[PDB]
Amino acid sequence: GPAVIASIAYMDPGNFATNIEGGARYGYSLLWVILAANLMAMVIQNLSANLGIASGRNLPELIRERWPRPLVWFYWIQAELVAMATDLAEFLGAALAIQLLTGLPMFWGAVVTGVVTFWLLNLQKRGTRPLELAVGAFVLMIGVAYLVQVVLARPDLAAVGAGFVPRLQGPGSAYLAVGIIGATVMPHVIYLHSALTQGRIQTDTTEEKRRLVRLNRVDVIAAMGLAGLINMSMLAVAAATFHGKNVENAGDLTTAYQTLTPLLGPAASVLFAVALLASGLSSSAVGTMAGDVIMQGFMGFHIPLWLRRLITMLPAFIVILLGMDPSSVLILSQVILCFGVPFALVPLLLFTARRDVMGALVTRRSFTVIGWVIAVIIIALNGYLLWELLGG
Numbered sequence: 357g358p359a360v361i362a363s364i365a366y367m368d369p370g371n372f373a374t375n376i377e378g379g380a381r382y383g384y385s386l387l388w389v390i391l392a393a394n395l396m397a398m399v400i401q402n403l404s405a406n407l408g409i410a411s412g413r414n415l416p417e418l419i420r421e422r423w424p425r426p427l428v429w430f431y432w433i434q435a436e437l438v439a440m441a442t443d444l445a446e447f448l449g450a451a452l453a454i455q456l457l458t459g460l461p462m463f464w465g466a467v468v469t470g471v472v473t474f475w476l477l478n479l480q481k482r483g484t485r486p487l488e489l490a491v492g493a494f495v496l497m498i499g500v501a502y503l504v505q506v507v508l509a510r511p512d513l514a515a516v517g518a519g520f521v522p523r524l525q526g527p528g529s530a531y532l533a534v535g536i537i538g539a540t541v542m543p544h545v546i547y548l549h550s551a552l553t554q555g556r557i558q559t560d561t562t563e564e565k566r567r568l569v570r571l572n573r574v575d576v577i578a579a580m581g582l583a584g585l586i587n588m589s590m591l592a593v594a595a596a597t598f599h600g601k602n603v604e605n606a607g608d609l610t611t612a613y614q615t616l617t618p619l620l621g622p623a624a625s626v627l628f629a630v631a632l633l634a635s636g637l638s639s640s641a642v643g644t645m646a647g648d649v650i651m652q653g654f655m656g657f658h659i660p661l662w663l664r665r666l667i668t669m670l671p672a673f674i675v676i677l678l679g680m681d682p683s684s685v686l687i688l689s690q691v692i693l694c695f696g697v698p699f700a701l702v703p704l705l706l707f708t709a710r711r712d713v714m715g716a717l718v719t720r721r722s723f724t725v726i727g728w729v730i731a732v733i734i735i736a737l738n739g740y741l742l743w744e745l746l747g748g
């Protein structure tokens with residue numbers, strides 16, 4: 357199931373942190389970012405899936421086989437830094453949820469998260485299917501809980517409507533908008549989606565290829581449509597809960613359960629932390645898997661899976677020992693992810709426009725143009741953020 361295993365990446369602790377902080381701090385004014393980032397991810401992941409189906413190779417493999425050696429090395433290094441920033445929010449997200457449930461310190465929440473992840477990687481595919489369905493049950497129901505709560509919260513509809521008009525509000529709004537974009541336009545999934553779809557054809561025919569393109573387009577847009585509604589609901593619920601009210605630590609993930617207290621009652625604290633834990637544990641295991649596939653595609657070899665798991669844990673323990681706020685680091689990691697998006701888009705936009713790669717499945721010129729517009733917008737947002745964080 358290519359869409360379902362990677363689907364948890366669109367509901368990782370990074371999405372929780374950016375949705376809650378965005379609503380509590382900036383009200384409904386960033387709803388247009390979630391809508392834009394979700395629409396971009398529809399185009400981008402469609403192209404990524406169409407690359408694996410049409411060519412039979414994933415994006416890192418094609419970069420390795422077609423581009424000069426130093427450019428490939430640069431692309432592996434930046435994708436490796438994307439994998440670490442992706443794992444930091446997910447690993448620390450599960451570690452934070454351990455604290456919300458047991459009260460353990462973050463260091464001990466990370467140790468438990470460390471033991472579970474190490475134990476989770478050794479398991480086979482048949483033993484993880486009950487766990488993958490279980491985490492899907494927790495996260496989906498919490499998502500549906502926000503879809504229902506956004507109605508019951510009675511949000512100010514004048515503010516909700518104005519939030520869909522693209523507007524920024526200070527240098528801090530650009531920082532969180534970039535974090536929202538990276539939390540939905542995830543570069544590691546841009547490389548991963550082309551590998552999930554490679555090797556799903558039956559008789560190598562163009563007719564079988566177009567069919568998998570049609571079927572994937574239906575599944576991606578439907579799943580992205582659901583995740584987008586959940587993300588906007590969670591931000592809108594967080595806005596109706598905390599924005600304007602003078603609540604201490606409003607937007608932090610330790611108090612995010614209060615968004616569902618009128619609906620779930622005293623159970624809201626546990627049901628949010630369990631969903632945050634299942635979100636962080638599964639997406640961290642998926643990312644470690646994806647990080648292995650991406651390295652094998654770029655370099656033709658990999659490091660042992662236990663070594664990759666151990667390396668990506670170090671920035672999580674260091675952040676804990678520095679006393680940094682976990683919700684802050686979750687947001688920052690999503691910001692770093694959004695900076696690796698243009699690097700992923702450039703080969704994706706070039707390869708899906710070539711006939712010697714796609715065959716009869718060359719992307720229509722209009723969507724290639726839409727793809728380059730998306731790349732330019734994200735480059736400019738990353739340039740406006742970098743500029744405002746330096747000076748002026």
Ligand SMILES: CCCCCCCC/C=C/CCCCCCCC(=O)OC[C@H](O)CO
Binds near residue numbers: 511516589592
């Ligand atoms: C369904 C999930 C969609 C999520 C998309 C992003 C959030 C924007 C949606 C707002 C709908 C809220 C409707 C709640 C009712 C509107 C309030 C109203 O019209 O008056 C009711 C009155 O206050 C009672 O007495």
Ligand SMILES: CCCCCCCC/C=C\CCCCCCCC(=O)OC[C@H](O)CO
Binds near residue numbers: 394395521577582
């Ligand atoms: C085809 C798949 C669906 C798209 C995938 C994402 C999932 C749903 C996203 C948004 C729902 C519609 C929200 C669009 C914004 C409606 C509010 C609006 O535009 O009117 C407000 C007015 O303009 C203020 O002045």
Ligand SMILES: CCCCCCCC/C=C\CCCCCCCC(=O)OC[C@H](O)CO
Binds near residue numbers: 706707710728732
């Ligand atoms: C002035 C501020 C910027 C101005 C506005 C942004 C324009 C620059 C952004 C992208 C360039 C478009 C890249 C065009 C490269 C595609 C053409 C091409 O070479 O075809 C691809 C083929 O598939 C490969 O072999």
Ligand SMILES: CCCCCCCC/C=C\CCCCCCCC(=O)OC[C@H](O)CO
Binds near residue numbers: 398716723
């Ligand atoms: C800036 C926000 C932009 C929002 C824009 C929303 C419209 C995108 C809707 C569906 C994705 C369409 C799929 C992307 C293009 C793939 C279809 C295609 O061209 O496929 C050709 C070939 O026949 C097969 O490989």
Ligand SMILES: CCCCCCCC/C=C\CCCCCCCC(=O)OC[C@H](O)CO
Binds near residue numbers: 721722723725729
């Ligand atoms: C949701 C989209 C909002 C729409 C406004 C956003 C602006 C995006 C830029 C271009 C749109 C795509 C149109 C690209 C037209 C030039 C490329 C093209 O398609 O030329 C081939 C054509 O078939 C020869 O007849």
Ligand SMILES: [Cl-]
Binds near residue numbers: 383515
């Ligand atoms: Cl307001």
Ligand code: NA
Binds near residue numbers: 681683
């Ligand atoms: Na926190």
